[PDB]
Amino acid sequence: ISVRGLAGVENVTELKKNFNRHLHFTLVKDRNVATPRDYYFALAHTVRDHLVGRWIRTQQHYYEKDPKRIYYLSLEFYMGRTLQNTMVNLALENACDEATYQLGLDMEELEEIEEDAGLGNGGLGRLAACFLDSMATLGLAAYGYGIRYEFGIFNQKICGGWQMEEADDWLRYGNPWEKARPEFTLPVHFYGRVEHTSQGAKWVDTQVVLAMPYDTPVPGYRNNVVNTMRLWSAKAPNDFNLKDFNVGGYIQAVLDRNLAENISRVLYPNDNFFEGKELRLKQEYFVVAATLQDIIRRFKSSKFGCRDPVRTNFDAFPDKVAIQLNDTHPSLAIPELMRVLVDLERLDWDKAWEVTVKTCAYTNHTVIPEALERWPVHLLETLLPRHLQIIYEINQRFLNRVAAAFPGDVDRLRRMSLVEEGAVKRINMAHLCIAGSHAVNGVARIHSEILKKTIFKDFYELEPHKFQNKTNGITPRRWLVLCNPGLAEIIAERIGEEYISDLDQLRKLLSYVDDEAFIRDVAKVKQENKLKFAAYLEREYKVHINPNSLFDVQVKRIHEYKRQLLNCLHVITLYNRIKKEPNKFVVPRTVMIGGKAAPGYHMAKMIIKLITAIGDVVNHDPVVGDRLRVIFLENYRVSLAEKVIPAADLSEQISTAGTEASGTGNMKFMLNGALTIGTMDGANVEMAEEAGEENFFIFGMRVEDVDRLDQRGYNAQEYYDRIPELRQIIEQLSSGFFSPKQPDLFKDIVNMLMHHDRFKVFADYEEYVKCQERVSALYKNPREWTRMVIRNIATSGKFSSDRTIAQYAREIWGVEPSRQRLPAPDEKIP
Amino acid sequence: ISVRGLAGVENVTELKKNFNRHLHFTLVKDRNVATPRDYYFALAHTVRDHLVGRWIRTQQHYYEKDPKRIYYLSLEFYMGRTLQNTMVNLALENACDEATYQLGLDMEELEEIEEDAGLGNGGLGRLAACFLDSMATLGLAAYGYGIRYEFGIFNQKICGGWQMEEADDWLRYGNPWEKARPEFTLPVHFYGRVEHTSQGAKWVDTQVVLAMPYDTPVPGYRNNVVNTMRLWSAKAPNDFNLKDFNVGGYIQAVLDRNLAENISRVLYPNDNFFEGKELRLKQEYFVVAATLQDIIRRFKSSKFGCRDPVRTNFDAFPDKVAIQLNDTHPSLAIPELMRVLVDLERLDWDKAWEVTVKTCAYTNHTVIPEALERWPVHLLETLLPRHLQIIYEINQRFLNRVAAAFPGDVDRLRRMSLVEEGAVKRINMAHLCIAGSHAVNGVARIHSEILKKTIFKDFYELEPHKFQNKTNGITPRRWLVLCNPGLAEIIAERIGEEYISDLDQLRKLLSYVDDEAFIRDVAKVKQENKLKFAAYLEREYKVHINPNSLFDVQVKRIHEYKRQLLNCLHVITLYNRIKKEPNKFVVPRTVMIGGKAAPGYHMAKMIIKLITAIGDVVNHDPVVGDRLRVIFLENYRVSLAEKVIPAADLSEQISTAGTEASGTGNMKFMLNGALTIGTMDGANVEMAEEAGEENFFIFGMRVEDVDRLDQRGYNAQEYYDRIPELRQIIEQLSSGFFSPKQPDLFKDIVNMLMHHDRFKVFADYEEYVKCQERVSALYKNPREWTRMVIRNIATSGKFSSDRTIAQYAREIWGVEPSRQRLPAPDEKIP
Ligand SMILES: CN1C(=O)N[C@@]2(O[C@H](CO)[C@@H](O)[C@H](O)[C@H]2O)C1=O
Ligand SMILES: CN1C(=O)N[C@@]2(O[C@H](CO)[C@@H](O)[C@H](O)[C@H]2O)C1=O
Ligand SMILES: *Cc1c(COP(=O)(O)O)cnc(C)c1O
Ligand SMILES: *Cc1c(COP(=O)(O)O)cnc(C)c1O
């Protein structure tokens, strides 16, 4: 059937009876009233059974051996569905497929019922998920720590061409993967004040919110290792949240509990944008405060909570603990670690600081200013008074370090301060992270260099040793084996299966680049993939596309820097050329644009309306025929990504050079047989470098050109004046060609494009359509297109998150990865 | 070990491995980290497994055979713990006891970990629970319908002698008994307006709240019948509760969902008191609206949703459906049934009314005016506009009936109206229920007569046929076998086990009233019970009592009509007599008073403070010694009741004649070997009638005497003037004898007692202490005390809820009870 494992005789039988046990005993249903949803849960529960045994021995193992622990703190974990992934990592896919078949059910149909774990916005959240999978696969004693939002990223609905947001009640029917652990609930404090008494400061008169943990298993790839993702839920104490007496109402007091519990109710839908709301800041301290107590408790036990030197010496803390800050969101971990060490454990400042810096590491994910976290001091002052004091003290000592290193450099001092003066005083969270971490890293080579040359230049001059790079990657399990079994099978037919956990082996595919059978196969799976997606489209969303055309897709969050608008300009250009010479041949294309716009991002929502507007015109022009279709992919999410990417021919990664830190979607397309048209931005540089620029469609300004233009001054009028095709489009938008009933509908877009384009869309226009012509030319030559594809796939190995994690492990965490199978799952009951 | 069933060889082994399966696979724990709480859940899950098989066949059965269905609507269901009860009804107690023993665990210790299902306030809520057990035991196709409050009755804490309320988070660790059924979620409407168009009225522009059901199994006693208790939970729709656009905030819109969900957040802690709050009214329509849709859906299928006459003829609706209104709380079921039939199904008014009256029945539970539901019209007008219109129309036609029956009786008309004029117009829910039901019943013979003679006199003259009586009862399973296995065993040794489902058989115990061995045994279990409680007291609450003294206990909600104050006067009297003649012998007593006071009931909370105040003085007087102890039983609830009642010697049922509708605690004490001192009120009359007044300690005014006094006019001063002992107590309270630091602390109680005692406490004082002397006299004669006890126990059979339910079934519902074992639980998988 494929190498989705063995469909053993004993195990298919075993699976079937357990499916039945759960349908009866767990679901309390009988075959006569069971619905596909019930069948999905019976299976889910049956699959979950297979990893509890391993989950328990893995955790027990780490307790016995006691290795250095890795704590990945992140406010986002974009998990997606977990049924198939679990079957894949446990070599259960074929067995389950067989058993459910014998039960008369279609596994694929049941898989579609699983709701996505949308606890993320995009890249940052998904990176965290891929990392978790890789850390488990590399046998690292790693723990993912975050918040269990009851409402993840909103589900997007397009009404009249506009995005409509609606709550993502992903828990409505329950989550069979998580395990509530109410017995490990911890208290978290807010507000209050600071008392300075005799031997130390005291955080007093605080409001208490409880953090209840929920554990979700994270299985490694076929190695019997099952790590843990602990997500905190906010709960109100039953005392004070009722007991602070003297009139108000008993009923009201109980109803008001949903005020402390709002902390984990919803994820903020902002991608690369900072919103200084109190609720967010509360979410940030909540996950940090709860997590740290859990980390210290585990440390207190270790082998110190037995003997060792005997005396809670936190000197070995960094040798046993490593906490990674996914961006600045969990940055309060630094002053909080200090607070506990200094205030509670009573360590001297300097010893505490040494420990903190040695256990913390920060990862930066963007260079755009509006994405930077700068919290107003009056907020921190009210909500976390002691942390503010600690931050000021950290700042004090840090700046003294600077003064001593750069005597008299008074401007440097203000520039490096963790405290920003002005309208309102703010705290620069990024500066905090650099100061209290022993390592700071970018997510792509150029991004990392930019940090050193620009944004964090001063910090780099002070401590050059802290700055590193760790190019992002993606997991070949979900992003290849899971979503593209067809491609994985033909690769395995030639080079085996060891590449799933050793992606570098894909290079061996280079020697089949002239193989006639392989070229035919690679081309066949892609065609099969396109047919399946073209079908899904009519199934779930309804209104035809042509599977023979070139599948041109750009899927990622809607942003001005991602330039969906530049993609739009090209689409309209194609349209206008066709209307000019109708009877001239052009390579057919289905351009698919999908992505979510943050609810308050007006421009982003305007762009979505533009895309649908273009489709309204283009898709109903008889002269165009089936040569050009414009489709907006609704509710783009992980599960939807697993469907489009494998069916894509052209991947669009056209952000303005220097704005996309790395990107990961680009990697997903490269490993799944799509060709890339893009700019020398983020990881695109390393991808073209790996496959050879000849096998890549690079265009536009490089970072240097962008800066040259900025020195000069960017004037869009110039481009409007010298390019008639561009002029024609702008006047089409301006006159209502695309919005008849509301002719001025797109005035904001035009206005922006002409007067405040921060991402110089026009500047890359000419080179973009010129380059688009070259991909059309090559698509006309199926054999050469597929051979270039093979050159990309065979060379994508470097972009696996196993590589990334192995580097973090060695160069930052100080641990050694291991592909050693944990001693079976085998029963056992001590 | 006892007749808690057989500890079979095959089944103890089977139980043990399933306990282990769940500890591993369900709890995801290993023996080395498992805590008593984990062990309790493994067991709970193991026990729950045994009844799903029966649960499924019982429900399938009713679907095949299609009998008349009984729907018990109630806003309260005081369930308590369900582990032991399930073991008892499934004959699993000894097997589980053995198996857990072999696993090295103490079952009793694990049982104590189960949280109480406190979804009730007192009598009314517990009656519903006992009924459910009886309906299952009598094989009735019955369904309990209510609300799944996430917070039940508050947990009571005594601080400085005052009651402190704290949220009852009974779901904190989860509920292994319920089964969420999100797939059967239904929509419920609120607000909106009424449109009158061409062919009928339309309820339009409403706000939608979703009702998600949760089913809990209700097993009959050893008959393999497992009925269902469906509890609704409020959920916000993800559309409008987000989709009603045009600024407000996406985050805020999501956080605001907890506004529609507040409907099922908390139970109103009022016992026999009406609070006209909107949230309550919403809770009342919510349970009614959701339930009715479920009822009609089931009816539409039946055997009509196949063939029958073919044409949705609701003429057979009453033949297939019976809905019982537990008090007026679910009274909106009447106008709602009309709304659906008329507005949606399009039946003519008269045919719809005929159906409604024929399927509905109302049970009245109190005669005090402040407990009567009278909803302001402006509330109904805003929240349920169409229901108000329907109610007015029902009123219109009803009054016309009256006018026609009593021509010219203009005062009768206003008195009987469902609409009350005055300050604010109100709707008398009780009048609504009488009009739209074919049967109205009281809960005790005297209570029922009072309804006919007083409160509903006019309604009785109009339709004498509607009024009936159904004396309350309690379940011998929980209230005997479960909480008093010792007594149940010795009874079984003599007369067998058939009495558990045929309590009348207890009469056979009359012939052992002179049996020397029996008297010794009855006396032995009571002593064992007292020793166990005296121990529990020091275990969980700490500060000694004497097991040889007479256990004088009054446990029930704190109310002025229950007269805990009269009990207080006696206690102080005993104290004062001892201080007067210290070296005179008196029968030792431990008087235990326990009960919860509604949060806003000031007097009730003052009485609790008084009780603790008396104990402070009495319990620390050296001259008193161990002859008199005053203890306030904290957090009285079902689970606590199962502990005290079996250990009680004297049961206090001293409400003012004519105020306690029936009472059920009194019955619990009678069947568990306690003697009753009380007034001729509620069921006390029928109990004394059944055991013989010679075996009862009756005192005080009868209803007639109360009325005579009211004609005359009640003047408490008179009693204060003629009884020196009474005078001495009042002046002790007035001067701070019981409250040194705050001498005027009890001015409200004294003031009330002297000037506004609605329950004439003083009037029954003399006859009360005189009577108390007689019980002390008889306690001095162990052999005769025990023989009187035997006379009570042997004669309590009439008070089993099986009797009550059998009567409801025959005289109201029109169904025949059956003690036929359902065809085993046996596997099966169609
Ligand atoms: C939102 N968001 C960011 O703020 N940074 C991001 O992180 C991802 C993983 O590091 C990168 O691939 C993206 O380029 C970057 O924009 C991202 O997706
Ligand atoms: C609160 N509450 C009432 O309103 N009525 C009650 O119902 C019980 C069951 O019918 C009766 O036994 C009580 O006497 C009556 O007070 C009760 O307990
Ligand atoms: C991989 C992924 C992303 C990141 O896409 P980029 O092109 O790097 O912005 C965002 N959303 C989803 C659903 C993803 O799978
Ligand atoms: C039986 C019961 C009641 C009713 O007691 P009465 O004496 O009828 O008021 C109240 N509370 C609990 C916990 C009960 O078990």
Q: Which residue has the tokens 């509301």?
A: A742
Instruction: Show the tokens assigned to B139.
Output: 């094989």
CA dist A408 → A404, A411, A412 (Å): 9, 9, 9
Interatomic CA distance for residues B548 and B780, integer angstroms = 11
Q: How would you classify the pairing of strands B155-159 and A628-633?
A: unpaired
Closest residue in A to B246 (Cα) is: A164
Sequence-separated (6 or more) residues with CB below 8 Å from residue A707: none
Dmax of chain B from CA atoms?
Answer: 90
Annotated binding residue A374: no
Which of B153, B268, B370, B443 is the pocket-test mutation for ligand 2 (most atoms within 8 Å of CB)? B443
Give the three-class secondary structure for A822: coil
CA dist B628 → A18, B570, B649 (Å): 62, 12, 15
Instruction: Show the tokens assigned to A746.
Output: 């797109």
What residues line ligand 2, using a CB cutoff of 6 Å?
Answer: B 122-124, 127, 271-272, 365-366, 371, 443, 472, 660-664, 682
Interatomic CA distance for residues A73 and A461, integer angstroms = 28
Which of A556, A561, A592, A651 is the pocket-test mutation for ligand 3 (most atoms within 8 Å of CB)? A556
Sequence-separated (6 or more) residues with CB below 8 Å from residue A513: A519, A787, A790, A791, A794
Give the three-class secondary structure for A437: coil
* Residue of B398, B388, B433 lying closest to B201 (CA atoms): B388
Give the three-class secondary structure for A674: coil
Instruction: Show the tokens assigned to A512.
Output: 């089949």
The number of angstroms, rounded, from the C-alpha of B758 to the middle of its chain's C-alpha atoms is 25
Which of B76, B364, B662 is the pocket-test mutation for ligand 2 (most atoms within 8 Å of CB)? B662
Interatomic CA distance for residues A115 and B265, integer angstroms = 26
- Residues of B serving a catalytic function are 365, 556-557, 562, 664, 668
Dmax of chain A from CA atoms?
Answer: 90
Question: Do B683 and B667 contact (CB within 8 A), yes or no?
Answer: yes
Q: Which residue has the tokens 């998920």?
A: A129
Q: Would you say how long chain A is, in residues?
A: 830
User: Is A24–B239 a contact, with Cβ atoms under 8 angstroms apart?
Assistant: no
Question: Do A441 and A469 contact (CB within 8 A), yes or no?
Answer: yes
Question: Is A248 at the interface with chain B, CB within 8 A?
Answer: no
Torsion of CA B191, B196, B199, B203, to 10 degrees: 0
Give the three-class secondary structure for A321: strand
Interatomic CA distance for residues A315 and A294, integer angstroms = 18
Give the three-class secondary structure for A232: strand
The number of angstroms, rounded, from the C-alpha of B595 to the middle of its chain's C-alpha atoms is 14
Task: Report the b/e string of A386-405 with b at 16+ CB within 10 A.
Answer: bbbbbbeebbeebbeebeee
Instruction: Show the tokens assigned to B498.
Output: 């058939």
Interatomic CA distance for residues B46 and A202, integer angstroms = 48
DSSP class of residue A151 equals B
Query: In A501-617, at which residue ranges do the beta strands (DSSP E only) sit?
Result: 550-555, 589-594
Element (H or E) spanning A790, and its range? helix A782-793
Interatomic CA distance for residues B714 and A687, integer angstroms = 97
Interatomic CA distance for residues B213 and B211, integer angstroms = 6
CA atoms within 13 A on the CB side of B355: 24
CA atoms within 13 A on the CB side of A144: 33
Query: Phi and psi of A209, rounded to 5°?
Result: -120, 140
CA dist A744 → A607, A732, A738, A747 (Å): 14, 11, 10, 5
Give the three-class secondary structure for A243: helix
Q: Which residue has the tokens 């036609």?
A: B397
Angle formed at CA A690 by CA A689 and CA A696, multiple of 5 degrees: 65
Sequence-separated (6 or more) residues with CB below 8 Å from residue A714: A757, A760, A763
Torsion of CA B345, B346, B347, B353, to 10 degrees: 80
Q: What region does A77 belong to: left with phi over 0, alpha with psi -120 to 50, or beta?
A: beta
Interatomic CA distance for residues A336 and A294, integer angstroms = 13
* Residue of B229, B184, B210 lying closest to A37 (CA atoms): B184
Counting beta carbons within 10 angstroms of the beta carbon of residue A374, is it exposed (0 to 12), middle (13 to 18) or buried (19 or more)? middle
A562 is known as an active-site residue: yes
Instruction: Show the tokens assigned to A48.
Output: 């979950």
Query: Phi and psi of B592, rounded to 5°?
Result: -110, 120
Sequence-separated (6 or more) residues with CB below 8 Å from residue B809: B70, B138, B140, B815, B816, B817
Element (H or E) spanning A375, and its range? strand A374-376
Sequence-separated (6 or more) residues with CB below 8 Å from residue A519: A513, A783, A786, A787, A790
Torsion of CA B512, B514, B518, B520, to 10 degrees: 170
Question: Do B506 and B491 contact (CB within 8 A), yes or no?
Answer: yes
CA dist A101 → A23, A29, A40, A532, B164 (Å): 16, 20, 13, 21, 59
Instruction: Show the tokens assigned to B49.
Output: 């497994």
Task: Report the CATH fold assignment for B474-800.
Answer: Rossmann fold (3.40.50)
Give the three-class secondary structure for B739: coil
What residues line ligand 4, using a CB cutoff of 6 Å?
Answer: B 122-123, 126, 556-557, 636-638, 641, 663-665, 668
Interatomic CA distance for residues A193 and A383, integer angstroms = 9
Interatomic CA distance for residues B666 and A714, integer angstroms = 90
Interatomic CA distance for residues A631 and B324, integer angstroms = 57
Interatomic CA distance for residues B616 and B154, integer angstroms = 25
Question: Do B764 and B700 contact (CB within 8 A), yes or no?
Answer: yes
Question: Is A301 at the interface with chain B, CB within 8 A?
Answer: no
Closest residue in B to A47 (Cα) is: B25
User: Is A265–B254 a contact, with Cβ atoms under 8 angstroms apart?
Assistant: yes
Element (H or E) spanning B325, and its range? strand B321-326
Resolution in A: 2.4
* Residue of B811, B70, B127 lying closest to B468 (CA atoms): B811
Question: Do B8 and B97 contact (CB within 8 A), yes or no?
Answer: no
Angle formed at CA B801 by CA B797 and CA B802, multiple of 5 degrees: 80
- The residues pairing with B310 across neighbouring beta strands, listed in sequence order, are none
Question: Do B136 and B218 contact (CB within 8 A), yes or no?
Answer: yes
Question: Do B68 and B814 contact (CB within 8 A), yes or no?
Answer: yes
Which residues of chain B make contact with A269, given a CB cutoff of 8 A? 250
User: Is B166–A53 a contact, with Cβ atoms under 8 angstroms apart?
Assistant: no
Q: Which residue has the tokens 């384009």?
A: A757
Interatomic CA distance for residues A98 and A12, integer angstroms = 7
- State in Å: Cα B125 to ligand 4 middle: 9
Query: In A85-127, at which residue ranges do the beta strands (DSSP E only) sit?
Result: 118-119
Interatomic CA distance for residues A478 and A86, integer angstroms = 10
Listed by the residue before each break, gaps in chain A with C–N over 2.5 Å are none
User: For B52, which of A25, A35, A243 is closest by C-beta distance?
Assistant: A25
Interatomic CA distance for residues A433 and A360, integer angstroms = 8
* Residue of A281, A713, A661 lying closest to A448 (CA atoms): A661
- State in Å: Cα A78 to ligand 3 middle: 10
DSSP class of residue A474 equals B
Query: In A524-584, at which residue ranges do the beta strands (DSSP E only) sit?
Result: 550-555
- CA A822 to chain B, closest CA, distance in angstroms equals 18
CA dist A184 → A213, A294, B807 (Å): 7, 9, 51
Which residues of chain A make contact with B258, given a CB cutoff of 8 A? 258, 262, 265
Neighbours of A335 (CB within 10 A): 27
Which residues of chain B make contact with A154, given a CB cutoff of 8 A? 250
Q: What is the CATH number of domain B1-473+801-824?
A: 3.40.50.2000
Interatomic CA distance for residues A706 and A720, integer angstroms = 18
Instruction: Show the tokens assigned to A669.
Output: 């397309």
Map out the domains of chain A as residue ranges.
1-473+801-824, 474-800
Interatomic CA distance for residues B480 and B533, integer angstroms = 16
Which amino acid does the sequence have at B707?
A: D
Instruction: Show the tokens assigned to B383.
Output: 């929240």
Decide if A1-473+801-824 and A474-800 have a common fold.
yes
Question: Do B355 and B341 contact (CB within 8 A), yes or no?
Answer: yes
Which residues of chain B make contact with A24, given a CB cutoff of 8 A? 52-53, 56, 829
Which residues of chain B make contact with A260, given a CB cutoff of 8 A? none
User: Is B238–A269 a contact, with Cβ atoms under 8 angstroms apart?
Assistant: no
Interatomic CA distance for residues B662 and B474, integer angstroms = 12
Task: Report the b/e string of A30-65 with b at 16+ CB within 10 A.
Answer: beeebeeebbbbbbbbbbbbbbbbbbbbbbebbeee
CA dist A578 → A626, A632, A727 (Å): 12, 21, 17
Angle formed at CA A57 by CA A52 and CA A61, multiple of 5 degrees: 150
Window 699-758 of B, Cβ < 8 Å to A: none
Interatomic CA distance for residues B310 and B314, integer angstroms = 11
| Residues making up the binding site of B for AMP | 30, 63, 297-306
User: For B56, which of A30, A35, A53 is closest by C-beta distance?
Assistant: A30
Interatomic CA distance for residues B287 and B300, integer angstroms = 20
Torsion of CA A432, A434, A436, A438, to 10 degrees: 170
Query: Phi and psi of B195, rounded to 5°?
Result: -105, 130
CA dist A565 → A369, B526, B604 (Å): 21, 86, 71
The number of angstroms, rounded, from the C-alpha of B727 to the middle of its chain's C-alpha atoms is 38
CA dist B605 → A409, A581, B118, B157, B750 (Å): 71, 90, 21, 12, 15
DSSP class of residue A330 equals T
Sequence-separated (6 or more) residues with CB below 8 Å from residue B376: B276, B424, B425, B426
Closest residue in B to A23 (Cα) is: B829
Q: Which residue has the tokens 């490993």?
A: A671
Interatomic CA distance for residues B427 and A485, integer angstroms = 68
Mutate to test the interface with B, among A254, A267, A279 (most CBs of B within 10 A): A254
Interatomic CA distance for residues A391 and A359, integer angstroms = 18
Neighbours of A421 (CB within 10 A): 10
CA dist B560 → B93, B120, B563, B565, B656 (Å): 41, 20, 5, 8, 9
Which residues of chain A make contact with B277, given a CB cutoff of 8 A? 251
**What is the end-to-end Cα distance of chain B in Å, rounded?**
39
Alpha helices in B275-362 (DSSP H): 278-301, 317-320, 333-339, 349-359
User: Is B28–A56 a contact, with Cβ atoms under 8 angstroms apart?
Assistant: yes
* Residue of B339, B203, B222, B209 lying closest to B262 (CA atoms): B209
Annotated catalytic residue: which of A4, A329, A387, A556?
Answer: A556
Window 130-189 of A, Cβ < 8 Å to B: 151, 154-155, 164-169, 172-174, 179-180, 182-183
CA dist A392 → A62, A361, B497 (Å): 38, 20, 77
Query: Phi and psi of A723, rounded to 5°?
Result: -120, 105
Annotated catalytic residue: which of A22, A386, A477, A668?
Answer: A668
Instruction: Show the tokens assigned to B537.
Output: 């007291």
- The residues pairing with B77 across neighbouring beta strands, listed in sequence order, are B119
Instruction: Show the tokens assigned to A630.
Output: 């414009």
What residues line ligand 3, using a CB cutoff of 6 Å?
Answer: A 122-123, 126, 556-557, 636-638, 641, 663-665, 668
Name the experiment that determined this structure: X-ray
CA atoms within 13 A on the CB side of B629: 21
Which amino acid does the sequence have at B316?
A: A
